[PDB]
């Protein structure tokens, strides 16, 4: 069986089975029209994406459903990494991975107060004391 | 009683 090579934005070459790599619709369409560049995606990020793709090689996805336990542990990374994994999935057109990452972000928000959400993402409360109250009472 | 009231015959 044949492989493709995906090159990270750091110039590092990742060898991966072709049909497995076709999880990326960008790669699949690239072949339809072997080394494919993945510009502006860090090596460590691309490496995670490939790990996810190889793990899910036999997975069939539709087509709200919850995150698979392997995915939850796999997506248990620092926020910057989670951010870049989401961007790479979006660039590479891997909808199920994109979906999974978004579900994990939503889980960070779920059942949390505005103040707790702010602490999680280090967000500045830019509401004036007046505007803060007006929003609470349901705008 | 079947639950449905009806007018009487004319």
């Amino acid at each position: 069986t044949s492989n493709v090579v995906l090159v990270s934005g750091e110039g590092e070459r990742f060898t991966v089975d072709k049909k497995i790599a076709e999880r990326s619709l960008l790669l699949k369409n690239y072949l339809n029209d072997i080394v494919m560049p993945v510009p502006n995606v860090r090596s460590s990020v691309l490496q995670k994406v490939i790990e996810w793709a190889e793990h899910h090689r036999d997975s069939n996805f539709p087509d709200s459903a919850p995150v698979d336990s392997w995915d939850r542990e796999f997506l248990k990374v620092d926020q910057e990494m989670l951010y870049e994994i989401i961007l790479a999935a979006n660039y590479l057109n891997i909808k199920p991975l994109l979906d999974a990452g978004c579900k994990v972000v939503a889980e960070m928000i779920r059942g949390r107060s505005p103040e707790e959400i702010r602490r999680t993402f280090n967000i500045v409360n830019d509401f004036t004391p007046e505007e803060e109250a007006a929003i609470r009472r349901e705008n | 009683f079947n639950g449905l009231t009806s007018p009487q015959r004319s």
């Binding site: 910057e80 989401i86 994109l98 059942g111 505005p114 959400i117 993402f121 500045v124 | 009683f1 639950g3």
Partner: protein, 450 residues
């Protein structure tokens, strides 16, 4: 650290995807996180559209009508904010309906001179009732008070249909069809022609013209144009003879027995009769399209499902039939009652039926698989019920029940405990109304879930 405002940083569509995975509570909290989060959330229509749809507050097909209504109510709000405000109001109201520890405010008002109420309409902040006392009573559902009594019928009132702009149509045992203007407090038209009691009626609009269709115990249906409003008389305008009535369209003959039920939309009208058959009419051509034969006993109720182009029929033979109105063919026979099935309702997702043995059945509105099943414990005949995707309210002798259709559980069984009979029940949003009997008298009950 390595912390990051992911919602702000990510492209809009992706952050939107994240919010679609959240429950409304989390979305509400998220609005209070920062100015940017606030801006991002209030930007999408789809977010609030999805929530409204997911809670069955609106259907995809009903969305446009909701939006327009919201624009009329909130002219100076964006579509997004309109939908958010609508959602918050609806979810607040629904939670009250579902809370077994919530109790609605109750207003009890004088009913008719007779203890039995025969018909009720609830539209446009009006509650309208008819009885065998020959009277029509109109109530304000906002202020929860009696407005006026419409008199003129020489016989009992057995059919009522609200049109628009305070206009309503009535049918009586005096064989007349009457048009009323609530805001003038009088009858404007009396249409004669039926040779027996007007048993049922519906109003349809076809090509921007409203028509009245009236079923009678004379085995016929009469079709009439609904008179337009005036600008700037000898009210009521009495029309003793159909041919000399410019609002008269024609007679639909076909049934061999009383026309018990009628249901129409656009130019298509379905009638059900005591002759065990239904007829699908084309009131534009005034012609019979199909005769639906197969029931072995009286038809008591029919619904024209115009969205799916189907007919639903309920019979004394205990069966419910589904008909394909594209070819006039039987589709399904539903067997879930052991008594007369005389009551049918159709919500966006449920066909609901109620029988004289106290049984109530919920069927999927599309494939008619079994969704729910209820039974009044005293095994008394179901006299009335009303339903949405979220709530069922049913009535019978000594019983008035409110069911949560999501959990399948009874929420309240005693709100109208003092009632002896429930003649008619109807609800919309925060307001539930019921025409009841208590100790030999009729009353109108109004329940407020805000």
């Amino acid at each position: 650290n390595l912390k990051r405002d992911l919602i702000t940083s990510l492209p809009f569509e992706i952050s939107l995807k994240i919010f679609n995975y959240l429950q409304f509570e989390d979305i509400i909290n998220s609005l209070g996180v920062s100015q940017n989060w606030n801006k991002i959330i209030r930007k999408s229509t789809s977010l609030w559209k999805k929530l409204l749809i997911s809670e069955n507050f609106v259907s995809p097909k009903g969305f446009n009508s909701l939006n327009l209504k919201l624009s009329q109510k909130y002219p100076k709000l964006s579509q997004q904010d309109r939908l958010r405000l609508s959602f918050l109001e609806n979810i607040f109201i629904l939670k009250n309906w579902y809370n077994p520890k919530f109790v609605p405010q109750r207003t009890t008002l004088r009913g008719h001179m007779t203890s039995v109420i025969t018909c009720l309409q609830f539209e446009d902040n009006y509650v309208i009732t008819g009885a065998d006392d020959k009277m029509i009573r109109v109530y304000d559902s906002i202020n929860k008070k009696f407005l006026l009594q419409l008199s003129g019928h020489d016989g009992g009132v057995w059919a009522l249909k609200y049109a628009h702009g305070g206009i309503l149509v009535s049918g009586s045992t005096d064989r007349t069809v009457r048009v009323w203007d609530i805001k003038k407090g009088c009858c404007t038209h009396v249409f004669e022609g039926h040779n027996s009691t007007v048993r049922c009626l519906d109003i349809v609009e076809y090509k921007n013209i409203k028509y009245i269709v009236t079923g009678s115990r004379d085995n016929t249906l009469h079709v009439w144009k609904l008179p337009k409003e005036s600008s700037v008389h000898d009210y009521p305008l009495v029309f003793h003879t159909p041919e000399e009535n410019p609002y008269f369209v024609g007679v639909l003959r076909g049934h061999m027995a009383s026309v018990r039920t009628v249901s129409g939309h656009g130019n298509i009208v379905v009638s059900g009769s005591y002759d065990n058959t239904l007829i699908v009419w084309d009131v534009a051509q005034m012609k019979c399209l199909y005769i639906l034969s197969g029931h072995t006993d009286r038809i008591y109720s029919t619904i024209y499902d115009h969205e799916r182009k189907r007919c639903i029929s309920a019979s004394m033979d205990t069966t419910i039939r589904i008909w394909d109105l594209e070819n006039g063919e039987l589709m399904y026979t539903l067997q879930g009652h052991t008594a007369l099935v005389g009551l049918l309702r159709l919500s966006d997702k449920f066909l609901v039926s109620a029988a004289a043995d106290g049984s109530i059945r919920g069927w999927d509105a599309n494939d008619y698989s079994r969704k729910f099943s209820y039974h009044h414990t005293n095994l008394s005949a179901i006299t009335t019920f009303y339903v949405s995707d979220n709530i069922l309210v049913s009535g019978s002798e000594n019983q008035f029940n409110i069911y949560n259709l999501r959990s399948g559980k009874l929420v309240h069984a005693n709100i109208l405990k003092d009632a002896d009979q429930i003649w008619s029940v109807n609800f919309k949003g925060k307001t539930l109304v019921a025409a009841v009997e208590k100790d030999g008298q009729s009353f109108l009950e109004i329940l407020d879930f805000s």
